[model samples]
Target: EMATVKTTHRTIAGWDGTPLGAFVIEPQDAGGGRYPLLVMPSSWAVPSVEYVGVAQSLAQRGYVVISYSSRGFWESGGSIDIAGPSTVEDVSALIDWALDNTRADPDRIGVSGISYGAGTSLLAAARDPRIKAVAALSGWADLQASLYSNDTPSAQGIALLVAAGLVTGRPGAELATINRNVLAGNYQGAVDSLLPVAAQRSPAASIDEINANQPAVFLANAFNDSLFPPGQLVDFFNRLKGPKQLQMRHGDHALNEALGALGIPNEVYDQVGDWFDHYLKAVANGIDRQPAVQLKSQKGSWSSYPDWQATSKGAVSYGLTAPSGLLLPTGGLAEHGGGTGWNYRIGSGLLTAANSGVAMASGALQMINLPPGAYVPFVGRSAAGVWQGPIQWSAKRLDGAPEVRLTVTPSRANTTLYAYLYAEDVLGNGQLISHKPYTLRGATPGQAKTLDLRLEASSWNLPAGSRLTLVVDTVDLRYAGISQLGGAVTFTSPANAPSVLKVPLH
Candidate 1:
């Protein structure tokens, strides 16, 4: 059951003249048999060895599977910037080699990987048309959005990935390539660690190539991915033109690894293997026989889609009103108060602002409550006088995404308002979510600014009556902008702002 190991190297000539080196892996069956070729590329090195087991298993199943380190990783030689065409060119050439030298089914080839791997595979499919089907494990279709999101447009999440593994494992020139950015502090290394580190799959320049080819893509993503973020993933689905399937699961970065692990609930390893078999080997195992979209372990059941999944679940909004007990002209009820908060899911005393303070004023929030062994996202950001509450809740555990839309009437028209949001637990101990901020163009005292304050939520059963508090703040240094400009802004709240804060019993 051992995979055939080879020490040979691949020299793939890309944009530049020289070639990119790729370490190759082949199954023992390749020595005297024919099999479909499966290419697996290394990502930012998280779950660095996660795919090792899958590779071995697939090889044993009579597939010529090759998992290689990206250029500049291991023995692969190149600059490793992953800027564009170069990396994809490397993939095309590598696939070409497998088809030419190995017993690969020329018409059948597929590529799979997560994070950076997703990006490369997607991009390779655009120009590499030679690939028949593509499966992107948490594929990062958009690099700019992944490394730097709308909420964190300037922070570099991938730097953390390099710091954690890539930089340490790359060659000297490649190491030198990223050292300058790190030393200059041009990009902060801090990030939503639970989310996957992102890199480019391909360039926007190749979008036409991708849309025209129409490849079969398998995409899986975490509900609360702060790094690559879900906004981009959902958008990617809409933009992609092809026969595709998307999977939603309750996990962060290493979602695939978690699902395919030894003792989880579903046997997705077999599912993934079956998928590859159906596409590559013409096997009638009924892999594609299921729905196009598979939501695993959702509400204790599997939800499938025939073609694409379209829902307003990921993009969030809140319900708010004012102290007058009615929604502001802008949206939800308005609230005026200082706050205390908390954020913890396991025990008491999680009731604190950042797990330290109580709610200054009660109001509705967007976060969810989870059970002992469920996966949930607790992300909240606090800024000048405004905050976005957490939005993750167990399935039907809570009522809705509520907010206290504040109407701050400053003494003058040109004024500044700062707000912040935090994800809190039972005792109210809270943490920061995306850290993305909002600035009202002409918001003055007595004016309503309905911010996109709902935190992203996932579907899971939540015990009714559990608390997810919204602790508002007036000043936030990290993600807020400074404006000592024109006038005083008065804050207002709705009469039932507190009513919307209810955590109903299941």
Candidate 2:
């Protein structure tokens, strides 16, 4: 159950003189003496009230919880900057106000939140050394990567996020113009040339500062977060240069936070509170000695490790081969390589949001019952790659990031490739492990090109009779595909350039 706490409200001047609506909640026993402070920023486009339950719960634990609407939404002054510098600076200003006006311990301040708020917490800690601890839930370290994955613009996520922003905090007609320009450019041009420039002004840009400041950092992300998936979080976690901890759960972007607050056993807010207790309150808890990473699987199993990049027995190379008559793998994966493909076209609507969105929204997509017309199969064709293995073997677990290398020579003007790893059960149902999409604009007619791609990290177990299959296709519903007309795509593997997949084994 949630508890009650007294709140003090005020209006403060932001970095550029914008008025910020701020509130402070104190524990029942605090009698104006200095206590530790926990500053929580709100998610993008949402009012600060969404986090009131979280604030009250933390206040009940004896810390002063300070929260405010970000610059443009609710009662704040400026329009939404979409996690830009204005929002970051506003948090620092709020911290200063807390230090001067309240009984806030300047040396023992912490920050935490979900989604947009989570990113702000990390950015605030990076820019302001006064912050002693940070817990970023469902946040990102690489903002650009979150917006545009594998050189392809994240169309659905951007549209959904922008729509939310427009309704929540977008102030004037100028904002609409800005969004239009962003959406148009990314849809057609390189992900770098335009649109996502605002993303670069994120906390990920100053990770070195956050690491150098040396604050105790706690990061929590969901495996199936549609907006910011597990790969970006893993990348951020691997680059941390301080005492940091990672909690990887299973769900979309919103469910995990809601689950934690309800206190249904595996709640993460408890872990977050424990972190603040150890760092901000200076309590002598064993969190310091605990494993640095906690990874949760879709099957509800948890694995703890001291480091994110723990090595396994090494990697097992799976060589692709041509399938037989619209079938899976004609032959099991061998040390040598062979593959097949066919022409594929990009579709719209159901194809756009059905297969990719649903799979990414859930932790994994079932191989059986995939939406019709979402993907065109080249199973037996010479343009696709299908690999499978182990007619009889022990249960094997994929423990780390899977590395994929593709060398192809296409007689097409524009070529795009989507590679997926599937676990074929005994009944031959292919469950998606991970997939990566690569596109080459203006691909030369007959030039051999190599693509080095890394799939999202996973901790999946393959049953004894199960086999691993690599599926290569021309189009994916989630991403923007090549604009070229149909042409034959061929996969090649030579002694020098091995077109193989290196699956990290446990």
Candidate 3:
């Protein structure tokens, strides 16, 4: 093993004549045959320093690992916008470098990273196919859907975007108006300011083209990622035409320790290294020794199912029932709720009182409805929302992720409604696992829609002798963006709202 690794620098040419930064590392020895290559791109503000240890370690293990400052941040040339084309060009350039370096195996090259690094890796994987493996730990997949939020700037996502910008002094520093930019309400100019010229060049139109290419992907997303909701990521992963796995690492989106705490026994970094080593350098010790979808194993251990499929073992729907008005669990209808078309936004719904919409009394059940001045894709703990239910449950098992399907009607077009669902314990306190919304793209009224709320109920099940509770709300800070719709909310259970929340006995 060579003691001191030799570090080399190089610049890649962008299609627009701009120069991007990059680096190459190799063993310091009297070498003969070329080795496999590994490219690591620097994050937005994170320098190439943080990766020194890993790069050195990989080099010591006999792989030429390359890392660099993308285009804007540190010393890289051009301006920066996350999914910028220039960054992708630099990645392609890196692949070409691996081929021409003569000291590395082109076919054995791979990319690995987290956060911005992981995001860059995705762009690179899409651009250069010769690279053998890709490890996008805690990374992003679709920029249009992840960052820009498809329609609006995700509040949590934007907060992160804003904070990063402020620290780095980028062009769009204060552009942190929360739901405004992400929603593109009356703020088109602000939205444009946040994006790089190139990202804007590609819209939903490219979603089809982008999904056509498949790359080996490994993500460590938690069930509670507000910025890049796991549902959005899962949707892309399932749609991806290649072999892939998305294993939840039992953590949140904002912390590194959650992904890999020294106490966790196993780390994603070591696992990724092994994968790359196997494909990039042909180290087969245990590379092909583990399942693709390995989840956390605990009293309530996370499970693995080989690979992601379009459908699951099959989804079993648990019909729900609750009463309308004061408090009583019923099937559907918003009776005793409010005016025929009461709207919560204008402060007209039953949940608008101090108790908001939650009916506390233990044995009482109420199906509260928001009058319809207008409709919003929201209903949560904020504003006039309420939380009432027991929070105790017997040990349970829900081996799969969760989703919400609401039957809604908007008073107008292009409406956004955010709603949260849950199961309560004996204490009347429970976990909120499902947050859904009614998004009407200004479509025709006849177009009944089903929104994929993207909420995760990883903790909603319980053992025998325990009960469940479902909370209704419009804002849940832990998941996607804040409630942006200032319009009124009118909620009512329909023929399909819920039938009977029958808990299956084991």
Q: Which candidate comes out best when scored by lDDT? A: 2
Q: For model 3, state the Cα shift of residue 220 in Å.
A: 3.1
* Ten-residue stretch with the least lDDT total in model 2: 345-354
Residue-level error in angstroms, candidate 2, position 497:
2.0
Q: By the lDDT metric, which is better: model 1 or model 3? A: 3
- Clashes (backbone N, CA, C under 3 Å), per candidate, total 85, 6, 52
Q: Tens digit of lDDT per residue, candidate 1, span 1-506?
A: 54464434565554454455554556554347667777777665433335555566666676776766666665466656452456667777777778887777767788876655777887888877777777766556666555544333222233443453444245334334444554454443332321232333433445678788776776766543424545456567656676666665554223355333211223444566677777777789876667665654334445554543333333233333321113211112123322222111111111112311122111211111121221112222211222223334453322112223343334433332332233344444434322233334344545543343332323334333332334333323222222333333344443433212222212
* Candidate number with the higher TM-score (1 or 2): 2
Q: Report lDDT (Cα) of residue 44, candidate 1.
A: 52
lDDT string, candidate 2, 347-377, tens digits: 1111221134442341121111122222223
Tens digits of per-residue lDDT for model 3, 354-453: 2112212321111111112212113322343332323334565444454444444444454544444444444334344444433345545434443444
Residue 276, candidate 3: Cα error in Å is 1.1
C-alpha lDDT of residue 495 in model 2 = 52
